[PDB]
Amino acid sequence: YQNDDLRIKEIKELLPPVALLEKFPATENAANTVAHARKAIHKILKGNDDRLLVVIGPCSIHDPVAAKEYATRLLALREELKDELEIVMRVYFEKPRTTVGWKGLINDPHMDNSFQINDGLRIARKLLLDINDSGLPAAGEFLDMITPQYLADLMSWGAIGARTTESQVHRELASGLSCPVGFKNGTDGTIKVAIDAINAAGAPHCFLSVTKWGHSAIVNTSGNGDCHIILRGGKEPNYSAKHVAEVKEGLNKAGLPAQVMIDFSHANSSKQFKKQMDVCADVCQQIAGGEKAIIGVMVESHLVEGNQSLESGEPLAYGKSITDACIGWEDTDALLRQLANAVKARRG
Amino acid sequence: DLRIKEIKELLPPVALLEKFPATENAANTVAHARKAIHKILKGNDDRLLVVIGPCSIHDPVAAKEYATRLLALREELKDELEIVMRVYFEKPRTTVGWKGLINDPHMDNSFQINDGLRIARKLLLDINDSGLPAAGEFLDMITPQYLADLMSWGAIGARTTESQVHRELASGLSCPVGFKNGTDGTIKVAIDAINAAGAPHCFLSVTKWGHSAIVNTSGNGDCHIILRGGKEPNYSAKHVAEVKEGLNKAGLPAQVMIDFSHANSSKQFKKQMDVCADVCQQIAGGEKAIIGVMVESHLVEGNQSLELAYGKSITDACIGWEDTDALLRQLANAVKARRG
Amino acid sequence: DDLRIKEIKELLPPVALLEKFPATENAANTVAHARKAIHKILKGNDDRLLVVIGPCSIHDPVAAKEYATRLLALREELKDELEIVMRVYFEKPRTTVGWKGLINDPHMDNSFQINDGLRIARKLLLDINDSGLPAAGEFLDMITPQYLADLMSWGAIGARTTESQVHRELASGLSCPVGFKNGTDGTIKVAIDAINAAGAPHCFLSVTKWGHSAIVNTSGNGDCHIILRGGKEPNYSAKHVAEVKEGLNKAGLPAQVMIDFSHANSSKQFKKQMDVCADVCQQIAGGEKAIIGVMVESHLVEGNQSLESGEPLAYGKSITDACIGWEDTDALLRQLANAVKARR
Amino acid sequence: DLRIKEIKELLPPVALLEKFPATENAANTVAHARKAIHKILKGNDDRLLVVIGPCSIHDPVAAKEYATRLLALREELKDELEIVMRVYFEKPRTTVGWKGLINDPHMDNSFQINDGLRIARKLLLDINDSGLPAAGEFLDMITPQYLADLMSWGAIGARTTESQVHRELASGLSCPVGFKNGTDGTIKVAIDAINAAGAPHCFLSVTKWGHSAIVNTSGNGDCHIILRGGKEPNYSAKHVAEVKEGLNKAGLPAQVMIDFSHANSSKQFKKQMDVCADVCQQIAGGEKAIIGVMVESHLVEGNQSLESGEPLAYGKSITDACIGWEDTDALLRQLANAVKARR
Ligand SMILES: [Cl-]
Ligand SMILES: [Cl-]
Ligand SMILES: [Cl-]
Ligand SMILES: [Cl-]
């Protein structure tokens, strides 16, 4: 056609989501893990559970073998701490990036710019299935309208990226998702964008999306009431009590329950992975001191601490992030016990 | 699919391109206007790009009446201005409101999006066939597949300037793209978007066949900033120099488009005329960085609420025709001065 | 997969053709009225003959519109004895290598511009129906019919597919009457079976208007009939018509018949369609009422010609089967109308 | 429009290929058997192609036990016979009746086509993966995309041999294709079908993605006739000579596949044993133009009718009657001894 596809170099074939769902169907145990975890988070968001939702795991996944080793370790802590914590593993397959660089396992699983995205969807769905089947709920992030269709049935909770909290199509996506959804404050600390996203997400919408058959269609949503805010810092951290008090009043003024998930990382740690433990110390003191509004937290965590560069061409160390730096496993075990001990103190 | 109440059939883009193909005239209108904006953006034309038109389209009849008026002014001032009609089919907002001609053309909450796409693509076709190039707004990644072959220039929504999927959209679009600065006035987000949209990308998208696919884009060098104001207006000569310094440090061409409306006009539509005045003086004074402007105009001035008048915005207030005739000549005279 | 698959190319979905070329109110009225008219004839509440007459297949839309304009004048003049519908075929089934028709290769040069062919086919078919002239088609596969069937007032199943299950299933979902041809041999059983099968509802795999494969459920087509087209020797005489009318009554199916004046009934000789027209008119004049329809291969200029690629073709002349010219065509239709006015 | 009651979603072929992908053994099994039949059709191997197995499959369990037994004989007789198991998933009929495993896997008119496709592709996979090649029947244009990659040989439905679209389908298939003589015993439609299938074609079809496309095929040279009888059997030496001359007169190799059942057996399953003896006599006395045979064979001989709310005999055909295992073993040894005696 005329005036068409000048900046399009190549269109290639994408497996429809039904192909991935048929190849990797939920087991009964995987469907049970998803169903129970969703209901558990719903119960927390409705104020009928005094436990803390904990979304913890690698910035994103690059190696399914390290990821499954991580998942086994976190699952054991999930079983031991389940009276205090609802633990859900961060299983992200995309790292949003303004600059050039690896976009994540789905876009480029081979980490060599071969962009084998069908491979990446097979790898990602298989891993999510394996983790759920083991008993460990999974948390994802929704950056687009096409990718979630491949994985959403195995997600117990998801986040909308801070760079898309204001995006109408991402708010509409949320309003048709089957899992709970967290919306982050704006990259400058602004609360109102996230509150508007929750109100928009709770409403029905009619909009254009893609089906499980890989076809575009008109979709009508019912609205999603299981949405909440994620405090992730602005120019300065916003995890402290003063900020929690402001957000609580702000939600209540908007008619929303005063409830918050606090991201320990990103701008709340000033992108310094060890300060997640300093954020943890303060949030725990808030929780132990009686703060009911804090219903969840987020932590970037891996088997080995820190990060490493894909671009150097050095062989990758095992179990170490190639994107944001994470706390290692020993900090991760201590952090989770701190949280469980703060939830118990909140109670007694 | 607990929160999915209903799925309904959507015509693939290839059906609206087949029903409403570009005329040779509409295609030349698109080709020449894109090339012209490219030349302006490459620093090889001293002409000013003027994107001007209704806040949002609601009445195709009134849209065509306005297009005919603007076409004459476009013919008359073509030595100074590359005039392009603002053809936006929705006003992005946060709560209730008519979602626009595409989402609800029958203005009854029926959401006849297939009808809406027909009506919107026909309108875009008619306007391009008459000779008037069109500017659009790209809010999602599926709608542009139906309309973008008829667009000479596009703006990414202010609320999606920061979104990776919308920067990747821009990277594969066949027209120039404007990115608005942040709500606080800062320009880092738009600089990042321009840089993002300028690189090749591989991502998932829907083709003209209505099927999802893996898409590889080339990158889009014809991107630029749009100054729409932050808490304070950012149209003044001091603000332009500051942005031009910021652009230069980022290795980006020191060029800007100034939106006269919204916050740069203090929400007062008639005040867009005061921005013309300041902007015109800057141009007549020699300022070569201002390569474009954006103005909200209709046949009748102001706004109205669906809770009747012809040619009047049912959304944001717009200047009327007399002020639009005067504003366009004011800019063309300013370009003549700077040219000397 | 695909060692014998050389290339795959994109294909417009039917919704794209239906959206580009929507039925006018006139074409829709033409289609509706003609379908009602053929149903009444097939039920028995009308004595006029159904006449499906036109080129073997279309290769030149301009020539096809001149033919249609001429035929429309005669349809209006013989409308009280004849329900005239134009043969607008866009495929010629062939065993040997060669041209398969307009949709497959409209530029007749083995460029296979099938998206072009479908636009051309549907534009032509719509223009004919808007004029007021109803149209008859042939259904050779499950995919092509979706682009055209809303503009067909009647359809035939290829004689080489009359016992094919998918084709009987296709016929059970079409919105138009359908005709089933006897076998190469005079065997009429394969056609009776096909008529029963198409009257039944079925469930099978087909392609939608969106260009996607789907599971489809039909309701059954009762506006289906036989089409006698000869075999080893012709089979249009009231002797053969008797044999068939007895086998139809035997099988609970109306003893109605459509007679094809060409192909093996004409012994593959175009001019001999005039002879066949005589025997069939004699029976209709001799009171016989089973004959509800006929088929004729008819163009502007009689005969046929061999296609050479890049070579200009003679005007009005079929490049497939030989056809009778317009002069014989105007006479054959007046012969058939006289025969009906006699029937009364 | 007016006569369409319901449209339901159909899994695209890529969903079945992703769920049931060829393992390495299955692709090897298919690749070797395709090459071995091609070599046989080209006259570079004196071994006899034997397609043998149930009229159609209604029970994957019985099908796999049969595959196991047949696989053991494929190994033992490989030097004389290329044994391919008949894996059909429908008994074509204009009458009333079970429409096969893909249309109706649960044998109750539930028409669970997506389930049938899963069951049919999984069974075919399991058989090929064990090392036994499979033969298919092509009745429509849509179904083969789900299965053809696991078929080493196919036959076109007898009621579709003169269909252009089925001849075009064959021109694009990756396996050899058998074409059945006409119901009157005429071999003309089979010769026309063989010629048409050998030519490249351009035609509309559905892709692995469940979308209609324009397809161009290269042409299939590995096509041959299936002699299955007419109003009288056509397996005798007089008939073979008659067809061998009709194929030479047409420029096609003088080679035939003899179907032992249906009209060639007078609709009596045990009379397949008598066709076998005659065909063995021809071969053992130097007949080289018989390159393949087709036998309807199950674990347990005969057939039975499907009843609602009632169990079925195990291993027995619910469609056409088959010879059972004991005759099947004897038949295959007879054919193998006939190749030894011809060499
Ligand atoms: Cl990892
Ligand atoms: Cl308007
Ligand atoms: Cl013609
Ligand atoms: Cl079985």
Side-chain angles (χ1 to χ4, degrees), chain D residues 192-205:
Chain D
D192 286 340
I194 294 179
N195 281 328
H201 294 273
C202 181
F203 60 89
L204 304 189
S205 183

PDB file of all heavy atoms in Angstrom, chain D residues 192-205:
ATOM      1  N   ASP D 192      -5.274 -39.221 -14.628  1.00  0.00           N
ATOM      2  CA  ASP D 192      -5.446 -37.770 -14.594  1.00  0.00           C
ATOM      3  C   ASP D 192      -5.025 -37.192 -13.248  1.00  0.00           C
ATOM      4  O   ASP D 192      -4.350 -36.157 -13.196  1.00  0.00           O
ATOM      5  CB  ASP D 192      -6.901 -37.406 -14.884  1.00  0.00           C
ATOM      6  CG  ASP D 192      -7.262 -37.578 -16.339  1.00  0.00           C
ATOM      7  OD1 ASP D 192      -6.340 -37.607 -17.179  1.00  0.00           O
ATOM      8  OD2 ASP D 192      -8.468 -37.698 -16.637  1.00  0.00           O
ATOM      9  N   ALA D 193      -5.430 -37.841 -12.145  1.00  0.00           N
ATOM     10  CA  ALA D 193      -5.021 -37.407 -10.811  1.00  0.00           C
ATOM     11  C   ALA D 193      -3.508 -37.482 -10.637  1.00  0.00           C
ATOM     12  O   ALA D 193      -2.893 -36.552 -10.097  1.00  0.00           O
ATOM     13  CB  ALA D 193      -5.722 -38.252  -9.747  1.00  0.00           C
ATOM     14  N   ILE D 194      -2.887 -38.571 -11.097  1.00  0.00           N
ATOM     15  CA  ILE D 194      -1.435 -38.700 -10.980  1.00  0.00           C
ATOM     16  C   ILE D 194      -0.729 -37.606 -11.774  1.00  0.00           C
ATOM     17  O   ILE D 194       0.263 -37.020 -11.318  1.00  0.00           O
ATOM     18  CB  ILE D 194      -0.979 -40.092 -11.441  1.00  0.00           C
ATOM     19  CG1 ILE D 194      -1.526 -41.163 -10.491  1.00  0.00           C
ATOM     20  CG2 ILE D 194       0.550 -40.140 -11.493  1.00  0.00           C
ATOM     21  CD1 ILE D 194      -1.154 -42.577 -10.877  1.00  0.00           C
ATOM     22  N   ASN D 195      -1.210 -37.323 -12.980  1.00  0.00           N
ATOM     23  CA  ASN D 195      -0.573 -36.285 -13.775  1.00  0.00           C
ATOM     24  C   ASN D 195      -0.745 -34.922 -13.126  1.00  0.00           C
ATOM     25  O   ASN D 195       0.238 -34.201 -12.926  1.00  0.00           O
ATOM     26  CB  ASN D 195      -1.134 -36.297 -15.190  1.00  0.00           C
ATOM     27  CG  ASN D 195      -0.532 -37.381 -16.011  1.00  0.00           C
ATOM     28  OD1 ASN D 195       0.632 -37.729 -15.815  1.00  0.00           O
ATOM     29  ND2 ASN D 195      -1.324 -37.973 -16.895  1.00  0.00           N
ATOM     30  N   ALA D 196      -1.988 -34.563 -12.779  1.00  0.00           N
ATOM     31  CA  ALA D 196      -2.255 -33.275 -12.144  1.00  0.00           C
ATOM     32  C   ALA D 196      -1.407 -33.076 -10.889  1.00  0.00           C
ATOM     33  O   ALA D 196      -0.837 -31.999 -10.681  1.00  0.00           O
ATOM     34  CB  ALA D 196      -3.747 -33.152 -11.811  1.00  0.00           C
ATOM     35  N   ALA D 197      -1.297 -34.111 -10.051  1.00  0.00           N
ATOM     36  CA  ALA D 197      -0.524 -34.000  -8.818  1.00  0.00           C
ATOM     37  C   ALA D 197       0.965 -33.818  -9.075  1.00  0.00           C
ATOM     38  O   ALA D 197       1.668 -33.285  -8.207  1.00  0.00           O
ATOM     39  CB  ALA D 197      -0.745 -35.233  -7.936  1.00  0.00           C
ATOM     40  N   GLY D 198       1.464 -34.262 -10.235  1.00  0.00           N
ATOM     41  CA  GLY D 198       2.876 -34.109 -10.550  1.00  0.00           C
ATOM     42  C   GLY D 198       3.262 -32.698 -10.934  1.00  0.00           C
ATOM     43  O   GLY D 198       4.444 -32.345 -10.852  1.00  0.00           O
ATOM     44  N   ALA D 199       2.287 -31.877 -11.334  1.00  0.00           N
ATOM     45  CA  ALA D 199       2.479 -30.510 -11.788  1.00  0.00           C
ATOM     46  C   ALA D 199       2.427 -29.534 -10.615  1.00  0.00           C
ATOM     47  O   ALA D 199       1.717 -29.768  -9.631  1.00  0.00           O
ATOM     48  CB  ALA D 199       1.406 -30.137 -12.817  1.00  0.00           C
ATOM     49  N   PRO D 200       3.182 -28.440 -10.697  1.00  0.00           N
ATOM     50  CA  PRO D 200       3.026 -27.363  -9.715  1.00  0.00           C
ATOM     51  C   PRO D 200       1.691 -26.656  -9.876  1.00  0.00           C
ATOM     52  O   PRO D 200       1.100 -26.624 -10.957  1.00  0.00           O
ATOM     53  CB  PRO D 200       4.196 -26.421 -10.035  1.00  0.00           C
ATOM     54  CG  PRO D 200       4.461 -26.635 -11.500  1.00  0.00           C
ATOM     55  CD  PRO D 200       4.151 -28.091 -11.758  1.00  0.00           C
ATOM     56  N   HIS D 201       1.213 -26.075  -8.779  1.00  0.00           N
ATOM     57  CA  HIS D 201      -0.094 -25.436  -8.782  1.00  0.00           C
ATOM     58  C   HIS D 201      -0.061 -24.203  -7.895  1.00  0.00           C
ATOM     59  O   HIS D 201       0.796 -24.052  -7.023  1.00  0.00           O
ATOM     60  CB  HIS D 201      -1.195 -26.396  -8.314  1.00  0.00           C
ATOM     61  CG  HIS D 201      -1.415 -27.541  -9.246  1.00  0.00           C
ATOM     62  ND1 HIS D 201      -2.271 -27.471 -10.322  1.00  0.00           N
ATOM     63  CD2 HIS D 201      -0.870 -28.781  -9.278  1.00  0.00           C
ATOM     64  CE1 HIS D 201      -2.251 -28.621 -10.974  1.00  0.00           C
ATOM     65  NE2 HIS D 201      -1.401 -29.430 -10.366  1.00  0.00           N
ATOM     66  N   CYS D 202      -1.015 -23.317  -8.139  1.00  0.00           N
ATOM     67  CA  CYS D 202      -1.189 -22.129  -7.327  1.00  0.00           C
ATOM     68  C   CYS D 202      -2.653 -22.094  -6.941  1.00  0.00           C
ATOM     69  O   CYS D 202      -3.523 -22.096  -7.815  1.00  0.00           O
ATOM     70  CB  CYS D 202      -0.781 -20.863  -8.083  1.00  0.00           C
ATOM     71  SG  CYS D 202      -0.954 -19.355  -7.075  1.00  0.00           S
ATOM     72  N   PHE D 203      -2.927 -22.104  -5.642  1.00  0.00           N
ATOM     73  CA  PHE D 203      -4.303 -22.272  -5.208  1.00  0.00           C
ATOM     74  C   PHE D 203      -4.437 -21.771  -3.776  1.00  0.00           C
ATOM     75  O   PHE D 203      -3.452 -21.586  -3.064  1.00  0.00           O
ATOM     76  CB  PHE D 203      -4.737 -23.737  -5.327  1.00  0.00           C
ATOM     77  CG  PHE D 203      -3.905 -24.677  -4.506  1.00  0.00           C
ATOM     78  CD1 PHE D 203      -4.237 -24.957  -3.183  1.00  0.00           C
ATOM     79  CD2 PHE D 203      -2.808 -25.313  -5.067  1.00  0.00           C
ATOM     80  CE1 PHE D 203      -3.474 -25.821  -2.436  1.00  0.00           C
ATOM     81  CE2 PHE D 203      -2.043 -26.183  -4.320  1.00  0.00           C
ATOM     82  CZ  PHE D 203      -2.380 -26.436  -2.993  1.00  0.00           C
ATOM     83  N   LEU D 204      -5.680 -21.520  -3.388  1.00  0.00           N
ATOM     84  CA  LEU D 204      -5.986 -21.038  -2.053  1.00  0.00           C
ATOM     85  C   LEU D 204      -6.050 -22.218  -1.098  1.00  0.00           C
ATOM     86  O   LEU D 204      -6.574 -23.279  -1.437  1.00  0.00           O
ATOM     87  CB  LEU D 204      -7.317 -20.295  -2.060  1.00  0.00           C
ATOM     88  CG  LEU D 204      -7.343 -19.163  -3.071  1.00  0.00           C
ATOM     89  CD1 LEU D 204      -8.604 -18.335  -2.871  1.00  0.00           C
ATOM     90  CD2 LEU D 204      -6.072 -18.304  -2.962  1.00  0.00           C
ATOM     91  N   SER D 205      -5.492 -22.037   0.089  1.00  0.00           N
ATOM     92  CA  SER D 205      -5.444 -23.094   1.091  1.00  0.00           C
ATOM     93  C   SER D 205      -5.300 -22.421   2.452  1.00  0.00           C
ATOM     94  O   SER D 205      -5.214 -21.193   2.551  1.00  0.00           O
ATOM     95  CB  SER D 205      -4.296 -24.067   0.796  1.00  0.00           C
ATOM     96  OG  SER D 205      -4.275 -25.148   1.716  1.00  0.00           O
TER      97      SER D 205
END
